[PDB]
């Protein structure tokens with residue numbers, strides 16, 4: 001890194017030299033008028049080179065050699081180690097005329113070398129390495145580098161009704177565990193020469209994205225100092241002489257969104273005082289880049305950790321079955337007296353730390369969710385703005401492109417339909433997360449308009465494969481037609497959930513045509529899913545489903561939607577239809593090793609283990 005340091009006419013120039021740079025010095029400009037040649041002397045820790053246009057010749061400490069003065073003959077000054085005393089190191093140039101061997105004048109350069117390095121964990125191993133060259137850039141992949149920073153959205157101290165990042169304060173030593181470390185490492189004399197200061201700084205744009213902290217008095221009662229962030233764009237650093245390391249704790253405040261890529265930068269500069277009324281000049285600048293970790297969703301294939309359940313006191317039939325199914329599995333259960341519509345359990349991870357984050361958009365919050373190691377982020381709205389109209393596939397590979405965290409699926413309407421669609425802000429937020437490349441399916445053919453009404457995923461136990469379960473109106477009519485022929489014709493359906501029989505349903509011509517159109521809608525999605533998830537007909541199961549068409553021309557479940565089930569590894573919590581429909585579902589799913597359990601019904605939301613795959617090992621599209 002070449003830096004210009006000109007010699008000033010017959011005068012000494014004193015300057016700070018930052019290690020990692022090298023000086024180019026002009027000696028012709030400072031020479032007196034009539035000077036023909038020049039000579040030089042330099043100290044041991046200053047390699048000096050006389051450069052006569054291209055060719056650079058190294059020069060001895062006390063050389064008596066003289067070179068002709070020319071604007072194309074310059075110097076190249078390089079230092080390798082920091083100074084222990086302010087001046088010490090120097091370059092001296094003597095000037096002579098045509099007839100004379102005693103200097104007619106001399107210009108000097110007194111130097112003070114220091115090392116300045118703003119270091120972060122760019123290699124992603126949890127420890128702040130010394131000056132990673134790739135720290136001023138963020139690259140995706142297992143062979144890529146760049147520091148990662150979480151959003152501090154949990155509540156270490158539960159008194160305040162806001163999250164850790166809503167304030168510009170740190171109250172606990174636990175809060176520092178959710179922060180990324182940034183160390184300012186320096187070497188130099190006891191003090192900086194007169195006219196120099198080191199300043200840490202951020203842009204106005206990045207001020208509502210990061211929060212930089214310092215631990216003052218760490219040997220007794222520790223206090224935490226907010227030095228960069230909201231309304232603090234720069235901070236003057238106290239220079240400690242010799243070999244020093246200043247520890248900083250950086251926090252994220254924003255998730256990547258529409259207009260926020262996720263990348264933030266923190267800079268350090270050595271500013272040189274020129275005069276009063278004039279701004280200090282950044283002589284040296286070192287920068288570090290951080291990527292704010294995205295909010296990631298968890299598919300049904302990931303193992304369950306704990307089941308959150310919301311219902312009423314009278315919902316004892318539901319409560320017993322859900323607890324009996326949760327007993328079969330090796331996971332815990334929580335009760336709350338909207339559950340799968342207003343909240344969703346996701347996670348955030350960094351090389352050092354990782355914890356679950358709940359996204360909540362209420363159409364005040366829920367106490368059983370906010371706390372330590374559990375983030376809680378909160379937000380016109382149609383019925384399509386719901387967490388039921390959101391799904392996430394297991395990891396897929398679609399024509400060479402792997403999606404190791406799956407893909408988010410969102411319900412929508414056809415482009416020229418004029419129908420309902422999720423808000424542009426939600427779609428932009430999920431898209432901005434990048435790691436789960438969202439796909440828009442067609443759910444507007446349903447009265448509610450949710451993708452969980454017609455689809456879901458189940459793993460194949462003891463394998464790393466899964467199945468897409470699709471609602472099928474044709475599967476229902478084929479089952480009915482068979483039972484009607486087998487003698488079960490006048491049998492009453494939904495006995496415990498009108499007086500309807502198979503014969504009555506099959507005779508209803510108008511209902512046949514409605515379900516014919518609804519099967520078309522289901523197959524439109526089946527094609528988008530096979531296309532965007534790399535699925536074949538071997539990976540899909542058709543569960544019998546029946547619908548009724550409202551005045552808007554949309555579907556609404558005739559009997560309980562069996563596809564919206566609780567997936568707890570090999571154990572499925574399927575909604576009871578009120579039984580040949582249950583025996584058909586047991587015949588489709590049970591031979592594959594999936595134990596079915598029909599529930600009476602208000603809903604559930606399962607917190608799962610995050611993926612083994614670290615999101616930063618991915619390589620997403622632009």
Ligand SMILES: CNC(=O)[C@@H](N)C1CCN(c2nccc3c(-c4nc(-c5ccn(C)n5)c(Cl)cc4Cl)cccc23)CC1
Nearest residue numbers: 253254255342359360361377378379385386387425426429
């Ligand atoms: C730490 N703070 C920050 O980083 C903030 N600066 C960000 C945080 C993210 N923000 C949001 N933007 C869009 C959608 C959001 C949803 C959300 N809400 C729903 C939903 C469910 C029912 N409704 C009616 N809406 C569904 Cl489906 C999906 C999502 Cl992501 C929830 C909660 C926050 C959202 C923007 C501001």
Ligand SMILES: [Ca+2]
Nearest residue numbers: 123125127129
């Ligand atoms: Ca490291």
Ligand SMILES: [Ca+2]
Nearest residue numbers: 164165169170
């Ligand atoms: Ca805090």
Ligand SMILES: [Ca+2]
Nearest residue numbers: 156164175178
């Ligand atoms: Ca914290």
Ligand SMILES: [Ca+2]
Nearest residue numbers: 154178372373
């Ligand atoms: Ca925490």
